[PDB]
Structure formats: structure tokens, C-alpha cells
């Protein structure tokens, strides 16, 4: 089911050229940034979907996530599952690890205080994240089968809320420059 939902979000400076092409193709060169998330994907987020997606260009310089990117509320809840990076590989509280899509992920909470969320500039809510544990090749057809991360996160105790926001398929930067074409679907 094709994506609905363009996301084209920055803060804090620098330049984000983000293009929303044709079908699930999305775009996005980088330089001097902020923060920023840009991707395609759902309006309502889904904890069965499989989302696919090709990255043809995955060229962060420094720091960015190419990352399932999404939010409940019921409660507000952060969620990614990143697949690559540039320099940094994000963590946080070590829980456990999750295999899925040919991939073996860490899997980590942090809870976050005054800090921008869908809800606004100054609130406080958990994160989860499956981080692959080494860079996912790039340029070939992907999965990500979220239902696997979602199992996996109830299994340590990280339930989701049960008011699903957006689900996008992102390019994420922090404080870097770069490029990247992803196709989502």
C-alpha cells in the first residue's frame, strides 16, 4: 500500500535541498546543517507494515541516520530503525539484540526530557531504536519488517503507544552534509 505522507523537517541552520519525486522517490543534498528528518512514507503508521525501500545513494558526510522513522502517542513514543550511518552510530540503553531482514540490530531505549517532538519544542518521551550493528549494503531492494522490531521491543518491556503518527522511510542528519535518493514503498 503506497506511501501518502511527504516529511520535510529542519531546525537550527544550514541548507536541506530536499526534492519529493515521483512515486516513493524522495531526494535529499545536505550541507552545514541543524537537525533534520526528510523521508516518504504513511500518514498512520502501522505495527504490521512491511516497508520497503532502495537507497541508489546513501553519501552522508558526518552525521546521518538512513532510518525507519516514526511516532505513537497513547504514549508519546520515538521510534527508529536504523539501517546506515555516516560517522556516528546512534545508541542508547542497551536492552537486547533483534534479528530481521538479513540484519542483526542492538536494541536500546532513552528517555528523552525538554526536548522537539510532534507534540512540540519542550516535551518528554521515550525513544526506541534497533541500530544494525554494521552498515546495511545500499542500492538493492530492502525490507524492513517492523513487526519484528515491534515483537522484540515488547519482549524488553518497550510497548509502543496505541495512537500511531507518521511512518517514514528517512534520511536524518545531524550537524553534517551530504546526499541521498531513497525510494519508498
Same mark, same amino acid.
Given at each position: ?70 511516532? &505513537? ?73 517492523? &513487526? ?34 531513497? &525510494?519508498?514503498?
Amino acid at each position: 500500500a503506497s506511501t501518502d505522507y511527504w516529511q520535510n523537517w529542519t531546525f537550527g541552520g544550514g541548507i536541506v535541498n530536499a526534492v519529493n519525486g515521483s512515486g516513493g522517490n524522495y531526494s535529499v543534498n545536505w550541507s552545514n546543517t541543524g537537525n533534520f528528518v526528510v523521508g516518504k512514507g504513511w500518514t498512520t503508521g502501522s505495527p504490521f507494515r512491511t516497508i520497503n525501500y532502495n537507497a541508489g545513494v546513501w553519501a552522508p558526510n558526518g552525521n546521518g541516520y538512513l532510518t525507519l522513522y516514526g511516532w &505513537t502517542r497513547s504514549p508519546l513514543i520515538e521510534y527508529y530503525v536504523v539501517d546506515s550511518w555516516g560517522t556516528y552510530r546512534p545508541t542508547g540503553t542497551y536492552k537486547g539484540t533483534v534479528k530481521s531482514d538479513g540484519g542483526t540490530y542492538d536494541i536500546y531505549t532513552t528517555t528523552r526530557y525538554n526536548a522537539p517532538s510532534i507534540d512540540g519544542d519542550d516535551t518528554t518521551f521515550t525513544q526506541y531504536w534497533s541500530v544494525r550493528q554494521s552498515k546495511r549494503p545500499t542500492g538493492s531492494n530492502a525490507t524492513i519488517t517492523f &513487526t519484528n522490531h515491534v515483537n522484540a521491543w515488547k519482549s524488553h518491556g518497550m510497548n509502543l503507544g496505541s495512537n500511531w503518527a507518521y511512518q517514514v522511510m528517512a534520511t536524518e542528519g545531524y550537524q553534517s552534509s551530504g546526499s541521498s535518493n531513497v &525510494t519508498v514503498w
